[PDB]
Scaffold this active site. Structure first.
Site, PDB file in Angstrom:
ATOM      1  N   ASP A   1     -17.608  16.521 -32.615  1.00 11.03           N
ATOM      2  CA  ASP A   1     -19.004  16.216 -32.914  1.00 11.03           C
ATOM      3  C   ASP A   1     -19.869  17.463 -32.801  1.00 11.03           C
ATOM      4  OD1 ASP A   1     -18.437  13.541 -33.371  1.00 11.03           O
ATOM      5  OD2 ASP A   1     -18.632  13.045 -31.255  1.00 11.03           O
ATOM      6  N   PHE A   2     -19.436  18.550 -33.419  1.00 10.73           N
ATOM      7  CA  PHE A   2     -20.143  19.816 -33.313  1.00 10.73           C
ATOM      8  C   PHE A   2     -21.322  19.830 -34.272  1.00 10.73           C
ATOM      9  CE2 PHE A   2     -16.038  20.671 -31.578  1.00 10.73           C
ATOM     10  CZ  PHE A   2     -16.317  21.466 -30.482  1.00 10.73           C
TER      11      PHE A   2
END
Ligand SMILES: Nc1ncnc2c1ncn2[C@H]1C[C@H](O)[C@@H](COP(=O)(O)OP(=O)(O)OP(=O)(O)O)O1
Lengths: 115, 327, 195, 546, 50, 50
Positions: free
Chosen positions: C85-86
């Site tokens: 979830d960057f």
């Protein structure tokens, strides 16, 4: 043409009478109810005639064009003018060249001919 | 029953978009019965299923005197969303409208007392094409596979070009492709094909979606749709036509074989020596290797990572046509 | 079923560059994960807004070193936790300018990587890795350089030189953004080579 | 133009003005104080919006500039005119500029049946695209069209429609390949004129009560459009794509008139099946036409149709669930049109279809199976029809010795064969037995599962064919009699080949077989590539030879 | 004719007692008058509408 | 023409109403069976033999 207002109101009233008359007439094909419907509609027609008629007893009683225009408001017609001019330069190629400017009302036909 | 309710809303929903699509002028849809679909699917629990996906299931069947191919849906998914049910209605209406072109799979009616519709199509004994090939009990020659390639190219050009609104069926996969007795491919399952407005092949979409590998990374990192966002995926489809391999693959290697990466690195280094289809090595391939490497060059060319590097899909179909017209 | 499991999944949270176990709910519905506040917002609330703040010197490089520390917290110490979830909006800041990360087969609708965060191998295959994590961290570093040997990628300070972090960050990005799975970064070298 | 016989290419049609040119004209008229320049920049959006309301006529532009030239350039009355546009132009400053007079002098010189025909077009929204066929069935419905000399219904009303298009009162949206018109629209000044002439005698009130016949635009489920007792007609006018949602009680009101000759329900969804909605259509007596096209809940049309002895037109097309047609239509012997196109689930007819003789149009016939429905044998009875639509499904739909069922149809002009849901190979052999009449103006084979030609398509079997279209299908080649160039030729003037993947023929061979061509429209035929079309592949050209 | 007879002359014309009815005749003849010559029209009337 | 029977005026009237026609066979046949009725309609009284 050239009709007064009483004639206009009478025409507008007789159309409503025509519609309801041929409306109730179709129910031909007891007789009591239909006979009284015939009575009422006949008497209304006769009454309307009788009371309209003295108003007609009382009183008794064009569009053109030209090749003169302004050529300053004439918003650009150079393509149509060009095409029609190259149609007219081919006049001798037929025996009698006939052309048609077809359109709805107020579209530019007389003004493109004047141009 | 409550089934009458299933009539009196669903078709009405249905009605107000095909009038929105074709202004009501369409194909002679047949209305079937519940019991014939429960009979021909054999109460939908057998090995007569063709294939599956998330929202639907492809089955075979047999109503009287004609076997058919029946599509049905999943209740919980489409009743658990309340907003992506319009994709089902776009699927039925567009699968009606495309049904006159030959390289699509025709539609032969709709019964809709069920969850939402249940659809019926004409029969194609060559099943849906797998992640590598035929799911018949066994294997196709190269001319047959190239014919499949040119007609899938034709059908996608029919999607892009035949209308004033460009419909881009972004999830082209061999799994959506059926085959006739005469091996004529027929696309289906247009459920995610979005319809752009007219005059505009470039309008920002609503969410990125669809099928890892075939995703077109350009749209994945830009999130606006052009037609090239299909064309990329098409070339990977052609590689499944070429190799006889699955697209996403592993050979005891970390679940990691991008087959596009494999074929381009065997182009620039291996020099096209492993694209020679070990399913079909026993083929003649005398001058057919020439058109094979033309197909691999083209399939890499339409899978190129930028848009301008990629041909238009019309041109893809045209050079495919000249490739098979060399012989 | 749904309780002792989720407490086991969420109980392993003890790291400074992350969000600890602040709170939770009784969650008869889906996730009501209650984790209180982050005062100054995200990177995009300061980078990609023209409202508040111009650039500074390499304190955002310390933010990236601290988030790379957080990477080495969840990749090395814990055997199996992957972020996936960057975003720069997932990178959240304090008054101390420190990173605290929060906001956590083949399924159609893609969410991860509407822009260049996603790995090309994750594009072509869907393998869901730490290689995607280091590629996404490399392009986050590129966002820190960008704002959008003549490396004037900044548009507000033409004096990138004296700490030499621009050349090192660009060369480590040239190491991060290579397409295969064979020249891949490891995050402790990214820690030591950016200080 | 034809009565003078100018020429086809010596006519000239001036077009409506571009918006930039119209803005130039409106500045040159209104802002004539200095140069035709807008002397203040806050009136400009108002002026441009009024000019877009003019829509390209120079005459309305000069009239609006004439009534604004008598004005002191205050913003408020310019806004006022920008919302009350046609009302001021029918006041005409107490009749000075008079757009309406110059258009109405083209109105009032009509034959009175064309007056009643053109007035029904005042019952539509702003710029909807109107189908021709629905207007014609409306006109035959009230009896605005009469006939005696054989030209009974469709050609007579089509002559009425072409008479209205020849007066330049109606603009044609798009033709077909065969030149025939499907869709229609009118200019908005003419729309206001015909409304105002309907705002006379009680043709159309359209508000309130006193109305001879009404039209329903979209979504009167929550407005309660009001229906009084007179109501000679009710049509449904939808702007090409949305569906007029109708309440069930209003449909109950539709059976409560007594004098309702026209009733068509076209883009509609009801709250109940139309069987029990219309149980009391026996109470309707003098009803001419029903177009129940494209309505959802119609499984079965109601039983009480036997108290309908006039019923000149019965249309139910494109309704995909119309299972059992009722035998009560065999009773009354006085229809003209029976139109079931693309009606999928349909068990193929009652028996005595060849009983009633006055009908002209029979579309989507579906000849029966063995011990079923009705066959083609009694179609030989019908010596007045001129448009026929077949839709064949398998081999026992037809029978061999009924092959003479299409020779003697004298007045026939068109045949459409729809072999869409086709199964049997024997059908391909059984279709070849059918011969059209040697007079046949236009035919369309639109699916046709054969591979070669149908083995009657020769200039020998039909000399006078002019138009011909082949849509989708599995056709490969044309046989030897299809060329037939010893002395015979086609004189097919227009040709269409839509989506034929395997079709193989040659361009100059067509030209040496078809000497009299105007256009050839092909668009999806990847086999050919020898034509003069820009591509016979993925798009279409027309090839207008000159 | 009036285009010819007025061409190249300095013409004065007095339209007397002009009323506010059917006044469209004005701009049927207003293009009949040559311009750029010094020609003058004097309209005497009972209306400042006209 | 054999239905006209030698009058030039009926011939020119029939040719006048056929000159406004697109040469389709069917209405020519129609006129060949309904001859005097169209010539007493006279295209709403234009050519007017009668
Ligand atoms: N291109 C143009 N530029 C400026 N004014 C124009 C232009 N075309 C037409 N007009 C004006 C001239 C008249 O004031 C008005 C009516 O046009 P006009 O040509 O007289 O009508 P028309 O010939 O199209 O039809 P009709 O004669 O039947 O009324 O439109």
């Amino acid at each position: 043409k050239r009709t007064n207002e009483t004639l206009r109101t009478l025409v507008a009233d007789l159309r409503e009478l025509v519609y309801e008359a041929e409306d109730i007439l179709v129910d031909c094909q007891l007789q009591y109810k239909k006979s009284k419907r015939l009575q009422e509609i006949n008497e209304r027609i006769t009454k309307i005639k009788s009371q309209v008629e003295p108003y007609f007893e009382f009183i008794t009683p064009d569009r053109w064009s030209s090749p003169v225009y302004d050529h300053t408001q004439v918003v650009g017609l150079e393509g149509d003018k060009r095409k029609i001019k190259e149609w007219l330069f081919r006049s001798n190629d037929s025996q009698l060249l006939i052309m048609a400017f077809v359109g709805m009302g107020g579209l530019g036909k007389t003004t493109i001919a004047q141009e | 029953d409550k089934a009458k309710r299933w009539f009196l809303d669903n078709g009405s929903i249905f009605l107000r978009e095909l009038v929105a699509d074709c202004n009501g002028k369409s194909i002679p849809i047949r209305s079937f019965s519940p019991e014939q679909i429960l009979k021909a699917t054999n109460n939908f629990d057998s090995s007569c299923f063709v294939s599956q996906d998330v929202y639907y299931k492809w089955y075979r069947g047999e109503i009287e005197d004609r076997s058919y191919m029946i599509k049905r849906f999943s209740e919980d998914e489409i009743t658990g969303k309340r907003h992506r049910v319009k994709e089902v209605y776009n699927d039925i209406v567009l699968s009606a409208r495309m049904s006159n072109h030959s390289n699509f799979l025709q539609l032969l009616g709709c019964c809709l007392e069920f969850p939402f519709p249940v659809l019926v199509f004409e029969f194609a004994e060559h099943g849906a094409m797998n992640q590598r090939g035929g799911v018949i009990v066994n294997l196709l020659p190269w001319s047959v596979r190239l014919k499949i390639g040119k007609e899938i190219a034709n059908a996608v050009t029919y999607l892009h070009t035949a209308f004033p609104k460009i419909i881009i069926h972004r999830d082209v996969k061999p799994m959506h492709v059926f085959l006739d007795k005469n091996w004529t491919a027929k696309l289906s399952d247009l459920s995610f094909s979005i319809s752009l407005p007219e005059g505009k092949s470039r309008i920002e979409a609503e969410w990125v979606l669809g099928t890892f590998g075939y995703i077109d990374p350009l749209y994945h990192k830009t999130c606006f749709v052009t037609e090239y966002t299909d064309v990329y995926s098409f070339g990977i489809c052609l590689l499944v036509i070429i190799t006889g391999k699955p697209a996403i693959m592993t050979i005891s290697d970390g679940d990691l074989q991008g087959i596009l990466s494999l074929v381009r690195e065997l182009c620039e280094n291996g020099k096209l020596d492993e694209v020679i289809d070990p399913r079909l090595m026993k083929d003649i391939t005398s001058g057919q290797r020439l058109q094979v490497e033309a197909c691999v060059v083209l399939a890499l060319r339409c899978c190129k990572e930028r848009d301008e590097d990629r041909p238009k899909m019309i041109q893809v179909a045209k050079e495919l046509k000249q490739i098979e017209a060399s012989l | 079923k749904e309780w002792l499991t989720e407490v086991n999944y969420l109980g392993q949270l003890s790291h400074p560059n992350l969000v600890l176990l602040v709170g939770y709910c009784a969650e008869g519905e889906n996730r009501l994960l209650v984790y209180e506040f982050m005062p100054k917002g995200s990177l995009e609330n300061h980078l990609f807004r023209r409202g508040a703040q111009p650039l500074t010197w390499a304190i955002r490089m310390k933010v990236a070193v601290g988030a790379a520390k957080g990477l080495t917290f969840l990749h090395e110490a814990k055997s199996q936790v992957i972020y996936r979830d960057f975003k720069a909006a997932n990178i959240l800041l304090d008054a101390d300018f420190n990173a605290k990360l929060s906001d956590f087969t083949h399924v159609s609708t893609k969410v991860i990587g509407t822009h260049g965060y996603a790995a090309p191998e994750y594009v072509a295959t869907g393998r869901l890795t730490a290689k995607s994590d280091v590629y996404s961290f490399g392009v986050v570093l590129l966002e820190l350089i960008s704002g959008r040997l003549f490396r004037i990628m900044d548009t507000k300070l033409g004096g990138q030189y004296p700490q030499k972090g621009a050349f090192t960050a660009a060369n480590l990005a040239l190491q991060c953004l290579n397409p295969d799975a064979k020249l891949r970064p490891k995050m402790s070298e990214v820690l030591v080579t950016l200080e | 133009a034809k009565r003078v016989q100018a020429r086809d290419d010596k006519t000239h049609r001036p077009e409506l003005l571009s918006p930039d040119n119209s803005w130039l004209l409106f500045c040159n008229v209104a802002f004539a104080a200095n140069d035709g320049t807008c002397e203040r920049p806050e009136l400009e959006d108002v002026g441009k919006e009024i000019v877009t309301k003019c829509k390209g006529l120079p005459l309305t532009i000069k009239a609006v500039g004439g009534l604004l030239l008598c004005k002191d350039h205050v913003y408020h009355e310019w806004r006022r005119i920008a919302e009350h546009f046609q009302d001021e132009l029918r006041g005409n400053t107490s009749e000075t500029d008079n757009v309406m007079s110059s258009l109405q002098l083209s109105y009032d010189e009509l034959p009175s049946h064309l007056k009643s025909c053109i007035l029904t077009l005042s019952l539509y929204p702003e710029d909807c695209v109107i189908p021709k066929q629905q207007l014609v069935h409306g006109w035959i419905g009230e009896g605005f069209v009469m006939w005696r000399n054989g030209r009974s219904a469709t050609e007579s009303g089509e002559d009425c429609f072409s008479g209205l298009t020849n007066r330049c009162l109606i603009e044609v949206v798009d033709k077909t390949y065969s030149g025939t018109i499907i869709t229609c629209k009118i200019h908005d000044m003419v729309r206001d004129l015909v409304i105002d002439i309907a705002k006379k005698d009680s043709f159309s009130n359209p508000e309130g009560l006193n109305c001879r016949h009404l039209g329903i635009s979209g979504n009167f489920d929550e407005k309660q459009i009001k229906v009084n007792h007179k109501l000679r007609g009710v049509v449904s006018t939808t702007k090409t794509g949305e569906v007029n949602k109708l309440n069930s009680d209003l449909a109950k009101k539709f059976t409560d008139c007594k004098y309702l000759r026209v009733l068509d329900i076209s883009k509609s969804i009801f709250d109940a099946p139309l069987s029990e909605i219309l149980d009391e259509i026996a109470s309707l007596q003098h009803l001419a036409c029903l177009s129940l096209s494209n309505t959802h809940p119609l499984i079965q049309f109601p039983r009480s149709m036997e108290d309908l002895h006039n019923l000149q037109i019965l249309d139910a097309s494109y309704c995909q669930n119309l299972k059992q047609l009722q035998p009560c239509i065999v009773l009354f012997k006085k229809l003209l049109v029976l139109d079931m196109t693309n009606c999928g689930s349909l068990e193929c007819f009652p028996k005595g279809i060849g009983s009633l003789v006055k009908l002209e149009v029979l579309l989507g016939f579906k000849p029966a199976r063995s011990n079923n429905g009705c066959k083609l044998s009694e179609v030989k009875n019908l010596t007045n029809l001129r448009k026929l639509g077949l839709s064949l499904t398998r081999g026992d739909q037809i029978e061999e010795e009924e092959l003479d069922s299409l020779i003697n149809l004298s007045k026939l002009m068109s045949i459409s064969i729809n072999c869409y849901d086709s199964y049997g190979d024997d059908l391909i052999t059984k279709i070849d037995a059918l011969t059209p009449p040697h007079q046949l103006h236009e035919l369309s084979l639109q699916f046709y599962p054969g591979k070669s030609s149908p083995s009657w398509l020769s200039p020998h079997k039909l000399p006078m064919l002019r138009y011909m279209s082949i849509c989708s299908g599995n056709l490969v080649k044309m046989q030897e009699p299809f060329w037939g160039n010893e002395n015979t030729h086609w004189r097919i003037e227009g040709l269409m080949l839509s989506s034929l993947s395997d079709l193989d023929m040659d361009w100059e061979v067509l030209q040496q077989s078809m000497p009299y061509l105007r256009t050839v429209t092909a668009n999806w035929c990847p086999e050919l590539e020898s034509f003069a079309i820009e591509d016979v592949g993925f798009r279409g050209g027309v090839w207008m030879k000159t | 004719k009036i285009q010819q007879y007025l061409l190249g002359k300095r013409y004065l014309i007095v339209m007397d007692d002009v009323w506010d009815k059917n006044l469209s005749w004005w701009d049927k003849i207003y293009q009949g008058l040559p311009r750029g010559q010094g020609g003058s029209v004097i309209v005497t009337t009972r209306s400042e509408s006209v």
